[PDB]
């Protein structure tokens, strides 16, 4: 990551862009596994093997409360969603596939956001 991403505080204008990025991911057809926390009734061992769970509803709460101070912190929570999924599930599962697709989409949107901060 470049210096602006790591070190520039998130302004109010930056926060309007983060809200838009988040809503775009929540509207994607392959985001269904990630919208809410993993349900322990459907995966009884999940919370014993994933030490730092993350999901898009937790990220929305954090955006609304202005939790993030730097773009790097927002990117780290999003990346945790996809990394947790690829560690828990096998490479041939539909869950793993959805992580591949949605991370590519996130990177496209993140590049757009970064371009809009500066010019
Ligand atoms: C985001 C994410 O990784 N969700 C996985 C949810 C999930 C994984 C596995 C199963 S099982 N035990 O039926 O094979 C159920 C649900």
Swiss-Prot record:
Q: Which residues cross the membrane?
A: none
Q: Which residues form the Bromo domain?
A: 9-113
Q: How does it assemble?
A: Interacts with MAZ. Interacts with KEAP1. Component of the NURF-1 ISWI chromatin remodeling complex (also called the nucleosome-remodeling factor (NURF) complex) at least composed of SMARCA1 (isoform 2), BPTF, RBBP4 and RBBP7. Within the complex interacts with isoform 2 of SMARCA1. Component of the BPFT-SMARCA1 complex at least composed of SMARCA1 (isoform 1), BPFT, RBBP4 and RBBP7; the complex is catalytically inactive and does not remodel chromatin. Within the complex interacts with isoform 1 of SMARCA1.
The Swiss-Prot or TrEMBL note on domains reads: The second PHD-type zinc finger mediates binding to histone H3K4Me3.
Highest taxon above the source species: Eukaryota
User: Any idea what this protein is called?
Assistant: Nucleosome-remodeling factor subunit BPTF
Q: Which disease is it linked to?
A: Neurodevelopmental disorder with dysmorphic facies and distal limb anomalies: An autosomal dominant neurodevelopmental disorder characterized by variable degrees of developmental delay, intellectual disability, speech delay, postnatal microcephaly, dysmorphic features, and mild abnormalities of the hands and feet.
Instruction: Write out the annotated subcellular location.
Output: Cytoplasm; Nucleus
Q: What does this protein do?
A: Regulatory subunit of the ATP-dependent NURF-1 and NURF-5 ISWI chromatin remodeling complexes, which form ordered nucleosome arrays on chromatin and facilitate access to DNA during DNA-templated processes such as DNA replication, transcription, and repair. The NURF-1 ISWI chromatin remodeling complex has a lower ATP hydrolysis rate than the NURF-5 ISWI chromatin remodeling complex. Within the NURF-1 ISWI chromatin-remodeling complex, binds to the promoters of En1 and En2 to positively regulate their expression and promote brain development.
Q: What is the lineage of its organism?
A: Eukaryota, Metazoa, Chordata, Craniata, Vertebrata
Q: In which tissues is it expressed?
A: Ubiquitously expressed, with highest levels in testis. Present in kidney, liver and brain. In the brain, highest levels are found in motor cortex (at protein level).
The text of the family note is: Belongs to the PBTF family.
Q: What PTM annotation applies here?
A: Phosphorylation enhances DNA-binding. Highly susceptible to proteolysis.
